[PDB]
């Protein structure tokens, strides 16, 4: 299946309370592998997945210096944006940056990303094909022109289409035991008497990886959405994910409903039906 | 591996 490497950066100004907070997190697919937190005591980029620990001191020293340079740049940006938008230094603002790359099943580059946001809204991003910038407003236009004068877009692409893909491949290989794993969902169905005329059927998918999954209900062989509830896919806290779909059905008509589960780890989609 | 050079906005 496809893969991706993503870096997420969050910088928050903290008016008169020291330096802004800077947090950096790297993922490969749905697996976090590194982190940096300006408030943490180490002041080091740290491993969060087992396979990355095979990288040597040179890698950690370099990633630490780079993320620190990143922290400084974002710290300056907070002051610059405040200026662009003529905001006060007493207010807390947030800058977020995400960049990374996607590869197909063959591990060949599919697309890259470099997006920037100020206070939760798009500020400036590189377009889908990476060949131009999208600027939200005049403040972002100012950044856009500075970036086009420094050929930042071409600097980023060299990385997104090369370096980024190269490191993603390296990590996929080094952490093959877990990154290229496919944990099919453990499934089951529960039943609850809701009332004098209703019963709830809950279809569970658990301990699955990657996070991408599809859970759907059907009644009499037809897609069922009425009186259904589907929760956002969530992390179990052990590297795997969980998700469920429930439907309220008339008492006694339980077996006319079926839950269907599609996940990469399943050679075939599973179908669950209530067996009392 | 992270980007090395990042330009201020």
């Amino acid at each position: 299946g496809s893969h991706s490497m993503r870096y997420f950066f969050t910088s928050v100004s903290r008016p008169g309370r020291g330096e802004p907070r800077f947090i950096a997190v790297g993922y490969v697919d749905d697996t976090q592998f590194v982190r940096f937190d300006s408030d943490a005591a180490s002041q080091r980029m740290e491993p969060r997945a087992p396979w990355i620990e095979q990288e040597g001191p040179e890698y950690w020293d370099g990633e630490t210096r780079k993320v620190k340079a990143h922290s400084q740049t974002h710290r300056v940006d907070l002051g610059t944006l405040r200026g662009y938008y003529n905001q006060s230094e007493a207010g807390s603002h947030t800058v977020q940056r995400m960049y990374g790359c996607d590869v197909g099943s063959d591990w060949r580059f599919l697309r890259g990303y470099h997006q920037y946001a100020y206070d939760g809204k798009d500020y400036i991003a590189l377009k889908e094909d990476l060949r131009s910038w999208t600027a939200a407003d005049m403040a972002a236009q100012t950044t856009k022109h500075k970036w086009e004068a420094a050929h930042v877009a071409e600097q980023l692409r060299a990385y997104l289409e090369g370096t980024c893909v190269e490191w993603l491949r390296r990590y996929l290989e080094n952490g093959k035991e877990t990154l290229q794993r496919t944990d099919a969902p453990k499934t089951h169905m529960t039943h609850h008497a809701v009332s004098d005329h209703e019963a709830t059927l809950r279809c569970w998918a658990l301990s699955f990886y990657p996070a991408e999954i599809t859970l759907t209900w059907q009644r009499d062989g037809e897609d069922q959405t009425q009186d259904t509830e589907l929760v956002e896919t969530r992390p179990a806290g052990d590297g795997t994910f969980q998700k469920w779909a429930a439907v309220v059905v008339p008492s006694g008509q339980e077996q006319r409903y079926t839950c269907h589960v599609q996940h990469e780890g399943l050679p075939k989609p599973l179908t669950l039906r209530w067996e009392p | 591996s992270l980007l090395m050079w990042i330009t201020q906005c």
Partner: T-cell receptor
Amino acid sequence: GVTQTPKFQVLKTGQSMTLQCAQDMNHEYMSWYRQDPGMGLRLIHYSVAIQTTDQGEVPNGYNVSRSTIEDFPLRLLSAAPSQTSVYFCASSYLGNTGELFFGEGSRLTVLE
Amino acid sequence: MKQEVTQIPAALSVPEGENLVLNCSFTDSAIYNLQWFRQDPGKGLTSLLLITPWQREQTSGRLNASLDKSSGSSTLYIAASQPGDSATYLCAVRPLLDGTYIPTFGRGTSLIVHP
């Protein structure tokens, strides 16, 4: 631009001394070099961010600090005649063109 | 991969008016930029030009530098050389990927343009 001070200094062997270097360009990167007459630039220490410093080619006998983005002082712990040289501070963005900006230099002479 | 910058010629002595060509070669093509400076005896460094893999040429008066197609060399051209041009021309490159940001300087080309 980059402002180094002092431009000239005479020290007695064993004296401590701090060279100052400031820049108002919000350059993330600041660095110190020494260059003996007719020789090449040798990196002493550098800094990519506040509270982050790294050793260059010749860190022995020198200490630095990066408390603010503008300032990057160089401290000569205990002046020695071997430290007589011309010191240069250089800063840059760690993005944009990465162009280096040098200070005017500081000529230091340590004597017994 | 350890970067190594070589400048040829090491010394150059010419009569004024002559067009000059200074070379700055480097062993690691992965560079973020290449910068030329001039340094006069007992003085500091003055930046002359700054080129990058995405802005491969820059002109400043009678000076123009270019980052050659051979992804490992830069040439500095000094048109109609003047005695005021006399100085040591230094070239430095910065790393694109090593995460150190440390520039690597060449030994320089000592130029004397005779009046």
